[PDB]
Amino acid sequence: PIVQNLQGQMVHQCISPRTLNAWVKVVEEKAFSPEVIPMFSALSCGATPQDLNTMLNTVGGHQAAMQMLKETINEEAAEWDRLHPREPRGSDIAGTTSTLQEQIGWMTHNPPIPVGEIYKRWIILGLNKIVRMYSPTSILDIRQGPKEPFRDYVDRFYKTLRAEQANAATETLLVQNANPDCKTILKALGPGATLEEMMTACQ
Amino acid sequence: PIVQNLQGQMVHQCISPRTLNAWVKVVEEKAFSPEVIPMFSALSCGATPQDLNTMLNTVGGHQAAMQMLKETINEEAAEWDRLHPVREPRGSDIAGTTSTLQEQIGWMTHNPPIPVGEIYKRWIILGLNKIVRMYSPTSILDIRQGPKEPFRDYVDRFYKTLRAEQANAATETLLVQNANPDCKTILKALGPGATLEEMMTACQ
Amino acid sequence: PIVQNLQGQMVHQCISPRTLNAWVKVVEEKAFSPEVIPMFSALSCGATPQDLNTMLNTVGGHQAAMQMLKETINEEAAEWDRLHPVMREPRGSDIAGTTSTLQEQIGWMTHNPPIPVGEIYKRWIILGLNKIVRMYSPTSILDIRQGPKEPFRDYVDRFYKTLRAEQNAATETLLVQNANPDCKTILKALGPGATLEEMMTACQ
Amino acid sequence: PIVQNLQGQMVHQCISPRTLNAWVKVVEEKAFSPEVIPMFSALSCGATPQDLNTMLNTVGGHQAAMQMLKETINEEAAEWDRLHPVHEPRGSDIAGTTSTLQEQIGWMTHNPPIPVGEIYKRWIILGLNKIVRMYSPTSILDIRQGPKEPFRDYVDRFYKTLRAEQANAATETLLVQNANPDCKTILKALGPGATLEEMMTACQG
Amino acid sequence: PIVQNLQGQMVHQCISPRTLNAWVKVVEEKAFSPEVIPMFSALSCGATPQDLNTMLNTVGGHQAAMQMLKETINEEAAEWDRLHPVHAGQMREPRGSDIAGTTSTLQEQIGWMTHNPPIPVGEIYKRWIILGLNKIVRMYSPTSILDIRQGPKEPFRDYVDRFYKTLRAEQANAATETLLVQNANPDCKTILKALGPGATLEEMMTACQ
Amino acid sequence: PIVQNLQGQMVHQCISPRTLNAWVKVVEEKAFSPEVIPMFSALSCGATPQDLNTMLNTVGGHQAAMQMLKETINEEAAEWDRLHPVHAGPIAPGQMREPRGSDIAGTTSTLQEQIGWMTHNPPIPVGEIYKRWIILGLNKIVRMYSPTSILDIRQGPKEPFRDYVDRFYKTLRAEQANAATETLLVQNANPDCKTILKALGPGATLEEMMTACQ
Numbered sequence A: 001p002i003v004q005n006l007q008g009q010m011v012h013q014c015i016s017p018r019t020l021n022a023w024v025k026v027v028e029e030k031a032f033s034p035e036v037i038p039m040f041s042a043l044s045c046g047a048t049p050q051d052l053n054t055m056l057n058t059v060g061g062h063q064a065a066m067q068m069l070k071e072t073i074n075e076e077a078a079e080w081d082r083l084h085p086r087e088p089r090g091s092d093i094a095g096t097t098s099t100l101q102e103q104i105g106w107m108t109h110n111p112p113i114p115v116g117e118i119y120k121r122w123i124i125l126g127l128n129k130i131v132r133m134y135s136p137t138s139i140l141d142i143r144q145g146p147k148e149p150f151r152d153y154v155d156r157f158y159k160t161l162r163a164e165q166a167n168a169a170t171e172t173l174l175v176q177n178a179n180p181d182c183k184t185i186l187k188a189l190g191p192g193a194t195l196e197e198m199m200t201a202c203q
Numbered sequence B: 001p002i003v004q005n006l007q008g009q010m011v012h013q014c015i016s017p018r019t020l021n022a023w024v025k026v027v028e029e030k031a032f033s034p035e036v037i038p039m040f041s042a043l044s045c046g047a048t049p050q051d052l053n054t055m056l057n058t059v060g061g062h063q064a065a066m067q068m069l070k071e072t073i074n075e076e077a078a079e080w081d082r083l084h085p086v087r088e089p090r091g092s093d094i095a096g097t098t099s100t101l102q103e104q105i106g107w108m109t110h111n112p113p114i115p116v117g118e119i120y121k122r123w124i125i126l127g128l129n130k131i132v133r134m135y136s137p138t139s140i141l142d143i144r145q146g147p148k149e150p151f152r153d154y155v156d157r158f159y160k161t162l163r164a165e166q167a168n169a170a171t172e173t174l175l176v177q178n179a180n181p182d183c184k185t186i187l188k189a190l191g192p193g194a195t196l197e198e199m200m201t202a203c204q
Numbered sequence C: 001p002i003v004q005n006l007q008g009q010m011v012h013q014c015i016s017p018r019t020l021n022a023w024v025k026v027v028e029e030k031a032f033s034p035e036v037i038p039m040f041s042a043l044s045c046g047a048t049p050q051d052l053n054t055m056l057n058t059v060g061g062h063q064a065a066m067q068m069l070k071e072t073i074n075e076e077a078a079e080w081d082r083l084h085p086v087m088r089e090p091r092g093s094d095i096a097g098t099t100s101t102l103q104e105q106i107g108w109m110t111h112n113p114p115i116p117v118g119e120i121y122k123r124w125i126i127l128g129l130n131k132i133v134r135m136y137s138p139t140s141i142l143d144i145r146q147g148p149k150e151p152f153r154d155y156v157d158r159f160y161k162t163l164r165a166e167q168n169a170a171t172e173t174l175l176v177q178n179a180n181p182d183c184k185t186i187l188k189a190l191g192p193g194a195t196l197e198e199m200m201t202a203c204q
Numbered sequence D: 001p002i003v004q005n006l007q008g009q010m011v012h013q014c015i016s017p018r019t020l021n022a023w024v025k026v027v028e029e030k031a032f033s034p035e036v037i038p039m040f041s042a043l044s045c046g047a048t049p050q051d052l053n054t055m056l057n058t059v060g061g062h063q064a065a066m067q068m069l070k071e072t073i074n075e076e077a078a079e080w081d082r083l084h085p086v087h088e089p090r091g092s093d094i095a096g097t098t099s100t101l102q103e104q105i106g107w108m109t110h111n112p113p114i115p116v117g118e119i120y121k122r123w124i125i126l127g128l129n130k131i132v133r134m135y136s137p138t139s140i141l142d143i144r145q146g147p148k149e150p151f152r153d154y155v156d157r158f159y160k161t162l163r164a165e166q167a168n169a170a171t172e173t174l175l176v177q178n179a180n181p182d183c184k185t186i187l188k189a190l191g192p193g194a195t196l197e198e199m200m201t202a203c204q205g
Numbered sequence E: 001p002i003v004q005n006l007q008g009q010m011v012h013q014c015i016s017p018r019t020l021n022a023w024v025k026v027v028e029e030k031a032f033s034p035e036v037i038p039m040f041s042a043l044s045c046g047a048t049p050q051d052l053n054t055m056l057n058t059v060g061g062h063q064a065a066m067q068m069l070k071e072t073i074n075e076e077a078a079e080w081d082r083l084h085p086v087h088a089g090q091m092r093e094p095r096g097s098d099i100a101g102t103t104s105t106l107q108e109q110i111g112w113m114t115h116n117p118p119i120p121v122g123e124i125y126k127r128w129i130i131l132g133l134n135k136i137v138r139m140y141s142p143t144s145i146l147d148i149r150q151g152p153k154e155p156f157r158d159y160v161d162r163f164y165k166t167l168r169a170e171q172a173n174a175a176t177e178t179l180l181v182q183n184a185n186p187d188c189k190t191i192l193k194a195l196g197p198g199a200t201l202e203e204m205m206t207a208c209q
Numbered sequence F: 001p002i003v004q005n006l007q008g009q010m011v012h013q014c015i016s017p018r019t020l021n022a023w024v025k026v027v028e029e030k031a032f033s034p035e036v037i038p039m040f041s042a043l044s045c046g047a048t049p050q051d052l053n054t055m056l057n058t059v060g061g062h063q064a065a066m067q068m069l070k071e072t073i074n075e076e077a078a079e080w081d082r083l084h085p086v087h088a089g090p091i092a093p094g095q096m097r098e099p100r101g102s103d104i105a106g107t108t109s110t111l112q113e114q115i116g117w118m119t120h121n122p123p124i125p126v127g128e129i130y131k132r133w134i135i136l137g138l139n140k141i142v143r144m145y146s147p148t149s150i151l152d153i154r155q156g157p158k159e160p161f162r163d164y165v166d167r168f169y170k171t172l173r174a175e176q177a178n179a180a181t182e183t184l185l186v187q188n189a190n191p192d193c194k195t196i197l198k199a200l201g202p203g204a205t206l207e208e209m210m211t212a213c214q
């Protein structure tokens, strides 16, 4: 990673072992749950492309999703080569034809060229694709059970939505696919009600 | 976040991995108990508005409450935009939706300082309080002492429940009104205007 | 807290997650055993009043003891308003943290002459916590007596443990008085005025 | 390791206990999976040859793999002596058998820097690549999708095995071949020059 | 504790939350096992007497041993008040109650330690605490070095493990060597005598295996 | 131990709690496997003779092994006295005194004396010299705790060649604490894998021998 010294000078700090193990464990547990994308963005704060490639390589398993991310990176890197015809190229930003010297030289410059933050965008885009492919249920099938507390139903509704679109139609659909015991109370509250009101009434 | 450099300067650091994992595991265990409101504000020390979003996004599950927090933030930002007509920040800039980290750091380091990180944290704590209310099913009214329960355990449930609902003398009269008659009479034995130390020591 | 800057100064730092989690685990384990008091002191080293309120809000359960601590604080604070009448001078609610900003709290702690509103607030909290240690220990030193075969070490351990919550030569008289008659005679064979080492070595 | 002081001056520091324990627990758990190479390279950032030997020694078990690594180290060291004769370090110096920590630090901090830490790590990673191919239970040519295996679960085993062999366009040509006849037909139907995204979307059933 | 500033000045710091829980968990486990002394001296590295009191007050249970430690402190402090009588631009002569932290402030404790003629009121107090802790290790010792005999099947290594384990809690010598050979089970004891004198523990554990 | 200050100065630091607990857990679990030796040297990186004794003392159990290390230290110490006799006469001004074996072992030396020796220029690394003696004794302890010998490591009926070479070099790792190890490795292979190794030929890499039997 690249952090600033006590002398206010951007230097290349080594990737911390706590961040390495944290990222591997996140994938081992959450396994592409929507919160893995923010956890990757935060654990890769100011990371050179070499560091991003190291974090992705330590991912144990899920190799199918990794090739899909690799293809997404390849597509985005080529698009960078078109919109921007020394200048960094898509291969330099992805860490394939760039040295750590070149990556640091691009990041610690005035004006800077954040080859690490650009690469993190490409990674987050492909990772967002992986969360949609991994979403087991569609929002059209999230329907409140007979004895399911309304909080638990909304817990599944907005998680499924956070993975699919990784909209007032969600408001109509949430009531439309709700238990009748609660659906009557939801119509009682009337249109345009705070989610706090809906869940307070169906308690 | 924006911390204190050795030279007294306000420099921007990365969010700690330990602080990330701590916040995630706190929701996994305490699960919107009242004890999460101080834990969030303590792990969000000097946080930029962007750093606050990152923390709330790493929350695993409970995605119902998180939408409730979104709507709370959207309501508080509209009151900010109303009470500040038309570079001073607006509510979208405070919540980090239409602001960059450069802009957020700018407002936080200016003299005079506009603490957009602390103003956003204020709204978040509001929505988090409304969440703790909801995760408290039993109202303060239904907390009554069973005759086979000590008075210490009854006041425990009374003030733990009120802790969520509050986010007063009538609350103390409800503490006496909802006691088992074995100790309730001993509460009227002490009379009004007494310390909880005496109110618990006597019935013990 | 307010730690010493490595430039020889005094700068405000954020409350460590390790410090918070250590305090939460102490209450979840020892649960107001007397050893909880010195652990709170060490974990609140140079803490601002705001940092102290955060350590108390994170306490899981025991809310009956917490409201008691609030009343103790509201007592010690009204006391400061009395015998201290009148950067602005700190009042009782300023030291407690209910009407003082973190900047004002830092101002008093880093002033010269320094107004230690952090250590003052810590004294008020420690007193009420001592009331909790005494209340959570209904067993008195008078009822502590040695059983038939209970080793002398097992009886002395319970003796000074109960005495530690209640907080002296009267403890030495009560220690021998409440021993079982088999060892009590051996202690008299040692003679009056004996060390605890000798009193336990004899009754081995 | 040779870190950078907060005053900018590169300085030597002791190996972190967490860095050591992490490396041991990596081999205790992943045990020479393909992801063991990048974890070693990350935890050995800026390490000295002495520090590299300490990491490889704390490995409990897998001694056959470790001796195989040792022989790979000697082979690469014999080449370094021929291609780069010391009129200057030699192979044993970079390996850490005839050099001191002061000599290593001197090479790693010099106007003309001889990075014996990264050179030794290069040889170690090569031998560690051999261990991953050896511990690889199956070849990429023996991975075939079952009639009841979802196309995703088969692609997972495919690229997991491929990361072991390859320490490549022919990998995509083999993926379609070793599939169940149902999804295999749909893949040829999607047309060559497709994305794994589309190849999996078309076989969700 | 009194640590070194990055500049190089002796400055005071808070007791580490990690060092605190380290000491409490050592008592909860080893429970005055012989290795409790070294852990205390290490965790109290450069600690003020106030910090030394904090460590000794956070121990869970064992309150009887604590009063015995307090008595051992009072004895060593009174002897300090004897060997160094208080005489009435430097620091005042510390009395034993100051070294223990009963009648001294943190500023005074730091003043003695951070002074050109250093008065280490932390290391002297730590010597008193170590002396009283060694007493507690003897009391918690269940068996004596004279009652440690090799069981008929018990291997020699297992016997020598218990021998020096108990001796480490007692002493806190060639007669211990003879006591080791002589308390062994008879077959091995004859082998030890068959080795003769001038035997390293490596040799007498190698032959009797 | 002795660390390197931000201002570029060899200063003294307190032994780390995490470093201590890690060393205790290593002995509690691995318990004198040959990988405990490098873990000790790394955890005792630049440690004073005082810190070295603090680590060895906190070892719970194995007190018989610890006494064997103690006696091995005394042997190396008297040897240090033989080749480095302490000379009489008052210590030259500005120079450190001459250390003896008990000084290096920490029995008759203060922390400031150890610090002055290590941070001097020329530096006398009493910590590293003591560590050498400690490692030499720990090496004997690994040889004693070695269950079997390298000459008795013999491959089972269907035991794969890899599982046999693991036990082979593991045991040799304790004994050493050579081309004859090649003959000793081939000789003990079960008759199945034994023939395949002989068919390969001499001067064959371990990768070749293992890939062959497979």
Ligand SMILES: NC(=O)c1cc(-c2cccnc2[C@H](Cc2cc(F)cc(F)c2)NC(=O)Cn2nc(C(F)(F)F)c3c2C(F)(F)[C@@H]2C[C@H]32)ccc1F
Pocket (backbone or CB within 6 Å): A053, A054, A056, A057, A059, A063, A064, A066, A067, A068, A069, A070, A071, A073, A074, A094, A095, A096, D159, D162, D163, D164, D166, D171
């Ligand atoms: N265009 C490219 O080639 C390319 C190259 C790298 C690059 C460079 C240096 C070092 N590391 C890498 C990447 C980083 C990475 C990326 C990603 F999107 C997902 C990941 F997990 C890891 N990692 C590998 O290349 C390892 N790897 N190897 C294989 C193989 F098929 F060969 F077995 C497979 C991977 C796998 F993980 F990427 C996919 C399972 C399939 C960066 C971006 C690029 F665009």
Ligand SMILES: NC(=O)c1cc(-c2cccnc2[C@H](Cc2cc(F)cc(F)c2)NC(=O)Cn2nc(C(F)(F)F)c3c2C(F)(F)[C@@H]2C[C@H]32)ccc1F
Pocket (backbone or CB within 6 Å): A158, A159, A161, A162, A163, A165, B053, B056, B057, B059, B063, B064, B066, B067, B068, B069, B070, B071, B073, B074, B095, B096, B097
């Ligand atoms: N007005 C807005 O939109 C809005 C946008 C952000 C913003 C910007 C950039 C990056 N992150 C965010 C937020 C941060 C956040 C806030 C919060 F209060 C609770 C949280 F947990 C997380 N996070 C998401 O927007 C993700 N998200 N997405 C969905 C959806 F339903 F769409 F799937 C759901 C979330 C969910 F987590 F917030 C709630 C489950 C429902 C800030 C404040 C705003 F006002």
Ligand SMILES: NC(=O)c1cc(-c2cccnc2[C@H](Cc2cc(F)cc(F)c2)NC(=O)Cn2nc(C(F)(F)F)c3c2C(F)(F)[C@@H]2C[C@H]32)ccc1F
Pocket (backbone or CB within 6 Å): B159, B160, B162, B163, B164, B166, B167, C053, C054, C056, C057, C059, C063, C066, C067, C068, C069, C070, C071, C073, C074, C096, C097, C098
């Ligand atoms: N006079 C006051 O109010 C008062 C306010 C604070 C203050 C200010 C800012 C932030 N935090 C606080 C306190 C800190 C605290 C103190 C204490 F002694 C024990 C504790 F545990 C926590 N904590 C709360 O205010 C939360 N709180 N809320 C309720 C309620 F009844 F409302 F539900 C209950 C608490 C509860 F925990 F303190 C008691 C269960 C009852 C300081 C001192 C004061 F004098």
Ligand SMILES: NC(=O)c1cc(-c2cccnc2[C@H](Cc2cc(F)cc(F)c2)NC(=O)Cn2nc(C(F)(F)F)c3c2C(F)(F)[C@@H]2C[C@H]32)ccc1F
Pocket (backbone or CB within 6 Å): D053, D056, D057, D059, D063, D064, D066, D067, D068, D069, D070, D071, D073, D074, D095, D096, D097, F169, F170, F172, F173, F174, F176
């Ligand atoms: N030219 C050499 O010999 C040589 C020497 C070292 C060297 C120097 C100082 C300190 N450490 C070492 C190595 C480091 C190491 C390397 C490696 F590739 C795998 C590892 F795990 C460890 N470690 C040992 O030598 C210990 N060791 N000992 C034996 C024995 F057979 F003797 F028991 C066995 C080992 C074993 F681990 F290497 C193999 C099981 C067989 C460096 C590179 C060289 F080229």
Ligand SMILES: NC(=O)c1cc(-c2cccnc2[C@H](Cc2cc(F)cc(F)c2)NC(=O)Cn2nc(C(F)(F)F)c3c2C(F)(F)[C@@H]2C[C@H]32)ccc1F
Pocket (backbone or CB within 6 Å): C160, C163, C164, C165, C167, E053, E056, E057, E059, E063, E064, E065, E066, E067, E068, E069, E070, E071, E073, E074, E100, E101, E102
């Ligand atoms: N001569 C003294 O007075 C004296 C005073 C302290 C002192 C000062 C400030 C703060 N703390 C202390 C001591 C520190 C301590 C010492 C020790 F050796 C063992 C320990 F564990 C703790 N500890 C207490 O004061 C608490 N304490 N209280 C009682 C009581 F019986 F009164 F309830 C009991 C203790 C108990 F733990 F020490 C013994 C069980 C009995 C230092 C040394 C002195 F010489």
Ligand SMILES: NC(=O)c1cc(-c2cccnc2[C@H](Cc2cc(F)cc(F)c2)NC(=O)Cn2nc(C(F)(F)F)c3c2C(F)(F)[C@@H]2C[C@H]32)ccc1F
Pocket (backbone or CB within 6 Å): E164, E165, E167, E168, E169, E171, E172, F053, F056, F057, F059, F063, F064, F066, F067, F068, F069, F070, F071, F073, F074, F105, F106, F107
């Ligand atoms: N020549 C010496 O005496 C001698 C003294 C120390 C010394 C000095 C100060 C502080 N610590 C020590 C040593 C350090 C140590 C060494 C070692 F090799 C193994 C270890 F684990 C620990 N440790 C003890 O003295 C504790 N100790 N005590 C006994 C007893 F027998 F008395 F019970 C036993 C030990 C035991 F652990 F060393 C052996 C079980 C037997 C240094 C080197 C020397 F040469």
